[PDB]
Ligand binder design. Structure first.
Ligand SMILES: Nc1ncnc2c1ncn2[C@@H]1O[C@H](COP(=O)(O)OP(=O)(O)OP(O)(O)=S)[C@@H](O)[C@@H]1O
Ligand SMILES: [Mn+2]
Ligand SMILES: [Mn+2]
Ligand SMILES: [Zn+2]
Length: 512
């Protein structure tokens, strides 16, 4: 009926939480979003991996009168929210181009007459065949954009069909909007807001730390043996192993099977009833292990293995973010080889030059720098999302075996002072040439040869300077700007090192 369930909205949220979704307390972020959403103020909600984002629009939808529309690109999961929501008495529905015309009209007719409270619609469907015009007669009280980084060319998963979502604000000037995402760095967060035309929204950015996940890496070397010994050492704990090919999945699954490990294969070339069996056997812990391509929200996954490295940190974060959703101790292990990053680079550098290849090259490079990190793996991930932190976690493979340290105060001011001195406009190599005092026309053309930093670092190698700055980006003192061609930029945390007010310990850069 689209009828508000409670009389007092304030105490309504937590009423519903407990009485309708059975939970006991709100997860930080959650109340503030929900109260803001009931108030009618636009929002951008950035909740970490499996942090509880759907509740943020489901609870307000249950407490308001009218139709809440939820847009999502994940057809075949949207359907599965519908059914569980219907299970719990919640009057949900979805509407995509994958339905039959008869079935789409029936969902239109329940929105028309207010038998549907919550409507999950694919982006493409929402802008086609004058849907907005019909949507305007159904008392629409709230539009939620899920997966909202998908509208940005700067994120890791731009989808062209979300583009047209920038028309809705204009069409629906009193319609409150919320934009939800679990994966979007600063640029992308900023872009989401601009493109959807969020009106002075509350921007709530939860933390990205999952502290119960330990991040590890293993340098490949007879990797199949390494992958079998790794699994063995898990001593029965549940897991997902990610591979980039259907034959890697299929073959690994068979080898595990052959050693008495209850392991199955998952990928697109399985039949819809077979995937769902796989998923369900995994959900209940009938299977220890699922070997898969990039396609289950199980709360108790103990380990996530990446056999091949992802093309970006965003993907690496969502994929490892599947382990340990119950909050108990879990682990992510990435098997890496520097040749694997030379492949991807080769692959990428003969795709059509331009804007898109750049966005892709910056994101690959930052994935590549995480893998070759000499700094806490958790700090790399948080400072990549803009959650600037300098305290090592103590629960990742670099922190379990720290690299030899040296006082880097002098190295860091040199590097921090060059970046500021060149007006924060230049990428890593140019800066490093200025630090080393190369004989470069470009340098002479900009007069950087005249600077006092020019050549202060000549006695150390290009790789030394590369590591220093990479350690500064990993620690949150320096960002690489993706919208300015990866220009090295200074953050507030640089201030005390840059002033000489505080010392800084860095790893002695590795000889490679
Ligand atoms: N306050 C809460 N207390 C307990 N369980 C909760 C709470 N909020 C949500 N849940 C659960 O948290 C889980 C995931 O929340 P979702 O919204 O489905 O994940 P998400 O944060 O949106 O995930 P990603 O990053 O997109 S994968 C589900 O088990 C629940 O609905
Ligand atoms: Mn409240
Ligand atoms: Mn979600
Ligand atoms: Zn650490």
């Amino acid at each position: 009926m689209a009828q508000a369930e409670v009389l007092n909205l304030e105490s309504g949220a937590k009423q519903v939480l407990q009485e309708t979704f059975g939970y006991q307390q709100f997860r930080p972020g959650q109340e503030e979003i929900i109260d803001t959403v009931l108030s009618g103020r636009d929002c951008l909600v950035v909740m970490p991996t499996g942090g509880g984002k759907s509740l943020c629009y489901q609870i307000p939808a249950l407490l308001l009168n009218g139709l809440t529309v939820v847009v999502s690109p994940l057809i075949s999961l949207m359907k599965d929210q519908v059914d569980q929501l219907q299970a719990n008495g919640v009057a949900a529905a979805c509407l995509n181009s994958t339905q039959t015309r008869e079935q789409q009209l029936e969902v239109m007719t329940g929105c028309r007459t207010g038998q549907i409270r919550l409507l999950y619609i694919a982006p493409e469907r929402l802008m086609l065949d004058n849907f907005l015009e019909h949507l305007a007669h159904w008392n629409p009280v709230l539009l939620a954009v899920d997966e909202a980084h998908c509208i940005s060319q700067w994120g890791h998963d731009f989808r062209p069909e979300y583009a047209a979502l920038g028309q809705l604000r204009q069409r629906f000037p009193t319609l409150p909007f919320m934009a939800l995402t679990a994966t979007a760095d600063d640029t992308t967060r900023q872009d989401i807001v601009r493109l959807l035309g969020l009106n002075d929204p509350l921007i709530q950015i939860s933390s990205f730390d999952r502290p119960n996940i330990r991040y590890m890496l293993m340098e490949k070397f007879k990797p199949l043996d390494q992958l079998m010994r790794y699994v063995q050492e898990q001593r029965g704990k549940s897991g997902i192993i990610y591979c980039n090919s259907r034959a890697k999945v299929e073959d690994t699954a068979a080898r595990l099977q052959s050693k008495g490990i209850s392991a199955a294969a998952y990928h697109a070339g399985l039949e819809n009833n077979v995937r769902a069996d796989v998923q369900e056997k995994f959900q209940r812990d009938d299977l220890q292990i699922v070997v898969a391509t990039v396609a289950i929200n199980k709360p108790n996954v103990r380990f996530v293995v990446h056999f091949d490295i992802p093309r970006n940190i965003e993907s690496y974060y969502q994929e490892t973010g599947r382990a340990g959703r119950d909050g108990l101790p879990a682990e992510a292990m990435l098997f890496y080889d520097p040749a694997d990053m030379a492949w991807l680079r080769r692959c990428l550098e003969e795709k059509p030059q331009g804007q898109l290849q750049d966005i892709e090259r910056h994101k690959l490079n930052a994935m590549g720098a995480f893998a070759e990190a000499q700094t806490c793996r958790r700090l790399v991930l948080l400072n990549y999302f803009g959650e600037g932190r300098q305290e090592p976690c103590g629960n990742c493979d670099i922190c379990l075996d720290p690299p030899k340290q040296y006082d880097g105060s002098t190295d860091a001011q040199i590097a921090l002072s060059t970046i500021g001195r060149v007006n924060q406009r230049f990428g890593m190599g140019y800066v490093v040439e200025v630090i080393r005092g190369a004989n470069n026309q470009r340098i002479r053309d900009y007069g950087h040869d005249k600077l006092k930093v020019y050549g202060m670092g000549r006695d150390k190698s290009h790789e030394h300077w590369v590591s220093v700055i990479r350690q500064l980006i990993h620690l949150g003192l320096v960002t690489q700007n993706i919208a300015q061609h990866s220009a090295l930029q200074l953050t507030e945390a640089a201030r005390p090192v840059l002033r000489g007010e505080s010392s800084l310990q860095l790893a002695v850069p590795r000889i490679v």
